[PDB]
């Protein structure tokens, strides 16, 4: 024969050829590596994305395109638990491509669209990672799934505020441009541009929240899912002057200029540097040795973010909005092996009291001694001030509460109070295949594989109940995408997932057991982080 | 004539009185003068030793109560009147009391010295609840208690002035302790075995004698009940003492320290009492206008500083608290509280209550209190707020200062025994929501339940006897414990933090005197106020 028409689609820019993916449940059509911007190369480094200019002929969207230039983790080389996050395509600045999965055959009526935004501290990540494989969600729940690559590290987020040549936030604009692409083009794949649900994890979740808070993005989607991240986390944004300080120190460390001066001259010198040279020096600009702190991140400069995310969260009217938010059970453990004294994946990490107090300064960097003392007060058990196992769990809680749990809780409660229907979860199942040690519990990032249905992959060795569990979670996420309500339409018997409200603060546990409702996302701890500590930092 | 009731002490001769108890008689010598009356020109001055007398002093009845405010919040209510003066008020009040077995012991008997509480503004040794006859009969100790000057009369200070140097009420206690050293042997008491015990301001007083070298050679062991000398209420700085004494003068029509004290000395005692409470810098509970002053003399440094620097090897102390130290105080100022309803307060009242119960701190410090004591799963529940604010007041003022004293003394060489008193008296007239309130272990320590004319249960009498035995064991040996079989009371240490609960059940050993809450008060909040 000839050509597969289901695999042929015309978008505003030109024609595309896709590929038919086998899944355990049947075929899916995948359009992988669709260009959506001009390559941000050479003179276009650090600049906002330019829309992809139209093309003649057929573009093959048949495999994932390159990973945006980024650091590659070397802490445990060859270890599955870290390698799963590392680039699985070649690094290149030529990386602004998105992916579309759709049912085979293409839907007749408009189908709601899930749009994935990966995390990775804004310095890493890619849409090609095996655990963001969209084929299982699309087959199981008959949605359209979109994911995009966006620039990370200095390439996405180096900012010399006020400058035209490095305005900052261009990685967020990469995401915005892809969302505009979804609006203009998703119907051609059978998706509904009036039913678009963003969802992302860690920095992706923070990205999702920033699109909520930036009006030009807010009009591009209808619902949001924020997994283990929030735009108000202490790591997710930086002020203008500290952004400038980091950009300036980065340039200085790579010989630009031959410090400060003309912004045009400085960025021009930065543009002559090999991408890898920039990546090799990114961590050097951090004010102190820390965990959960990233050099180049969204900048609060009045443009993309008119105010800080907390301010915008407090001031916002969120009627008409449904949001699904949540955390894993042990948000903090993963980060401790990257700098906290006494921690390793390869032993029990039974730290001393002196190591705990040292880790508090690593986990809560750039706060006053008084503030550090307030942290030690809350997280020490004063009947057991020096018990190693309790100190290990307490430091894990410090990092997790500070960076994920309490930012998410503050977002959830404010949105609920101000007119949004919110649903909250804690993900509590520890995968049978997890390669991290037992003391880390359910670490940051390890709900994703279940949301995407990865246990359905024959090549993998999950249990049959984990496959049931994944199917349950895919159904929740897609129910929320379709209706703004994760609850399965007309099915009593099966326990209900209640909305999260600022008063009752109800959420559900996600594990192999049926839904269990509980109260308070670490309420006592998050009162310290969200109500008291900010007052101390003022005074 | 009963020769057992005739005693000669250094200043002359005394006639006592035989008292009855359900266990037999006791000899009592009540109203023994130990100082010259601190009247007229001697007001605000250190006490002077009583000059010798001829004849026989009548020592058969309690002497006058030192001038003091009389509580009026619930007139005629038993729970308040039991602390009010039960003899006439007079500045001529420096008398002490000796209770002794009958017949008087003929070999040296260990001595307990009782120092009453009352916020340094009130109290008397004549109160029914301090009646020494049951302890002396049951445990065969000599018991001494003294009256000391309270309020402005005892503690008004213009620091550096000699007309009103301050702390003279503490000097009243010291003089009585000197009197015990010189004269207790004439009653069968052993001056080499003197145990001080006291409650609230009396416990703070005990601790202060621990920390003042001239008092320290006058006793051997110490018992601190529901009080400590490092309590935020127990001492006052020089500048604030001078401000308070200066505002009292103005409030009573008086204008140089000499001319100021002179004018104060012309005023009827009741006039000073009437304005006493108005020199406090803000509306509060558990704060008292005229208290011991830190001025380098009696206390060479703050009690906190003195506690941290001290070598306490060879010291044994018994310390403890009641289950609900804060509840009693909430009806004297906390919005929404009353003994006559459930005191189910609002979140708003709770927050207002925090500034009453933790007065004179920054808003940030108050915020920190509100954070620690809010249940953020139930931020507005009235019952929890009532209990939380009682915890705030009780932890801040009693529990955590006592916990701090205990841990520092233990880690610096002392042998410490700690208790929580958890029995609610079947006769208690305060409401159920107050639990076991401040002060209501005393009647059990003094064996009042043994009084047949009172309405205690059979087990309550046995309980009182256990308590009297612990206390007198501690006085005799530095150790409240008895031969084994019975559950043992272990020493409190900074690490293990062990204490026993005292109730109708056998001793139960537990860990931590509100260690989580007391870390806040003892470790974090000082750092906050520094910044
Ligand atoms: C647990 O491991 C940490 C991390 O050390 C690494 O992993 C270990 C399994 C072992 O192979 C070490 O050699 C590795 O370097 C241990 O803390 C380190 O200790 C070494 C030497 O004592 C020191 O040079 C490092 O700086 C330490 N790392 C820190 C402080 O982050 C820790 O002692 C181990 N705990 C045990 C064995 O109980
Ligand atoms: C519980 O009582 C307090 C105390 O109020 C007094 O005692 C009561 C038993 C009753 O006799 C009241 O009339 C007395 O005023 C109540 O708090 C008072 O509330 C009134 C308003 O009615 C207010 O004007 C007073 O200022 C309040 N006093 C204080 C000290 O805050 C409280 O409302 C009662 N709780 C109830 C009724 O649930
Ligand atoms: N040399 C650098 O630019 C650099 C960049 C990022 N990090 C972050 O460290 C790794 N890490 C730290 C914490 C959690 C995950 C990971 C894995 N990233 O691939 C270190 C150095
Ligand atoms: N001399 C006075 O004017 C005066 C007024 C009030 N008080 C204290 O009475 C309140 N009170 C009485 C008994 C027990 C506790 C309390 C509260 N303390 O903060 C003492 C003196
Ligand atoms: C930087 O230098 C370029 C090169 O001539 C010039 O055009 C530009 O105006 C300069 N910018 C500033 C802010 O001085
Ligand atoms: P978040 C800090 O953006 O990223 C975590 C580490 C990851 C699992 C890589 C997405
Ligand atoms: P404390 C503050 O001295 O309390 C006294 C002893 C009482 C009258 C019992 C409240």
PDB file of N, CA, C and O and ligand atoms in Angstrom, chain B residues 83 117-119 199-201 286 288 328-329 438-439, ligand 7:
ATOM      1  N   UNK B  83      -7.381  31.456 101.410  1.00  0.00           N
ATOM      2  CA  UNK B  83      -6.100  32.140 101.293  1.00  0.00           C
ATOM      3  C   UNK B  83      -6.114  33.534 101.894  1.00  0.00           C
ATOM      4  O   UNK B  83      -5.044  34.108 102.116  1.00  0.00           O
ATOM      5  N   UNK B 117       3.284  30.981 100.130  1.00  0.00           N
ATOM      6  CA  UNK B 117       3.166  31.731  98.899  1.00  0.00           C
ATOM      7  C   UNK B 117       2.095  32.803  98.999  1.00  0.00           C
ATOM      8  O   UNK B 117       1.545  33.085 100.067  1.00  0.00           O
ATOM      9  N   UNK B 118       1.783  33.392  97.849  1.00  0.00           N
ATOM     10  CA  UNK B 118       0.821  34.472  97.779  1.00  0.00           C
ATOM     11  C   UNK B 118       1.319  35.625  96.935  1.00  0.00           C
ATOM     12  O   UNK B 118       1.028  36.789  97.241  1.00  0.00           O
ATOM     13  N   UNK B 119       2.089  35.304  95.885  1.00  0.00           N
ATOM     14  CA  UNK B 119       2.591  36.278  94.919  1.00  0.00           C
ATOM     15  C   UNK B 119       3.486  37.351  95.499  1.00  0.00           C
ATOM     16  O   UNK B 119       3.677  38.393  94.867  1.00  0.00           O
ATOM     17  N   UNK B 199       5.553  26.937  98.715  1.00  0.00           N
ATOM     18  CA  UNK B 199       4.709  26.773  97.537  1.00  0.00           C
ATOM     19  C   UNK B 199       4.550  28.123  96.838  1.00  0.00           C
ATOM     20  O   UNK B 199       4.402  29.151  97.502  1.00  0.00           O
ATOM     21  N   UNK B 200       4.625  28.124  95.495  1.00  0.00           N
ATOM     22  CA  UNK B 200       4.474  29.337  94.670  1.00  0.00           C
ATOM     23  C   UNK B 200       5.524  30.364  95.094  1.00  0.00           C
ATOM     24  O   UNK B 200       6.730  30.042  95.056  1.00  0.00           O
ATOM     25  N   UNK B 201       5.146  31.595  95.472  1.00  0.00           N
ATOM     26  CA  UNK B 201       6.134  32.574  95.941  1.00  0.00           C
ATOM     27  C   UNK B 201       6.972  32.049  97.107  1.00  0.00           C
ATOM     28  O   UNK B 201       8.115  32.483  97.299  1.00  0.00           O
ATOM     29  N   UNK B 286      -1.001  36.623  86.948  1.00  0.00           N
ATOM     30  CA  UNK B 286       0.252  36.029  87.417  1.00  0.00           C
ATOM     31  C   UNK B 286       1.412  37.018  87.347  1.00  0.00           C
ATOM     32  O   UNK B 286       2.542  36.635  87.047  1.00  0.00           O
ATOM     33  N   UNK B 288       2.903  40.498  89.752  1.00  0.00           N
ATOM     34  CA  UNK B 288       2.761  41.096  91.080  1.00  0.00           C
ATOM     35  C   UNK B 288       3.676  42.304  91.197  1.00  0.00           C
ATOM     36  O   UNK B 288       4.813  42.277  90.712  1.00  0.00           O
ATOM     37  N   UNK B 328      -6.435  28.274  87.756  1.00  0.00           N
ATOM     38  CA  UNK B 328      -6.835  29.166  88.844  1.00  0.00           C
ATOM     39  C   UNK B 328      -6.697  30.634  88.451  1.00  0.00           C
ATOM     40  O   UNK B 328      -7.596  31.445  88.691  1.00  0.00           O
ATOM     41  N   UNK B 329      -5.580  30.988  87.817  1.00  0.00           N
ATOM     42  CA  UNK B 329      -5.312  32.386  87.520  1.00  0.00           C
ATOM     43  C   UNK B 329      -6.209  32.961  86.426  1.00  0.00           C
ATOM     44  O   UNK B 329      -6.311  34.189  86.317  1.00  0.00           O
ATOM     45  N   UNK B 438      -3.588  25.163  91.024  1.00  0.00           N
ATOM     46  CA  UNK B 438      -2.525  25.741  91.839  1.00  0.00           C
ATOM     47  C   UNK B 438      -2.917  25.829  93.311  1.00  0.00           C
ATOM     48  O   UNK B 438      -3.970  26.371  93.655  1.00  0.00           O
ATOM     49  N   UNK B 439      -2.044  25.335  94.181  1.00  0.00           N
ATOM     50  CA  UNK B 439      -2.254  25.441  95.613  1.00  0.00           C
ATOM     51  C   UNK B 439      -2.911  24.243  96.262  1.00  0.00           C
ATOM     52  O   UNK B 439      -2.784  24.070  97.473  1.00  0.00           O
TER      53      UNK B 439
HETATM   54  P1  LIG C   7       1.547  31.851  94.119  1.00  0.00           P
HETATM   55  C1  LIG C   7       1.610  32.868  92.567  1.00  0.00           C
HETATM   56  O1  LIG C   7       2.253  32.660  95.134  1.00  0.00           O
HETATM   57  O2  LIG C   7      -0.036  31.505  94.547  1.00  0.00           O
HETATM   58  C2  LIG C   7      -0.536  31.587  95.902  1.00  0.00           C
HETATM   59  C3  LIG C   7       0.224  30.693  96.890  1.00  0.00           C
HETATM   60  C4  LIG C   7      -2.040  31.235  96.030  1.00  0.00           C
HETATM   61  C5  LIG C   7      -2.751  32.225  96.940  1.00  0.00           C
HETATM   62  C6  LIG C   7      -2.277  29.820  96.557  1.00  0.00           C
HETATM   63  C7  LIG C   7      -2.669  31.334  94.641  1.00  0.00           C
END
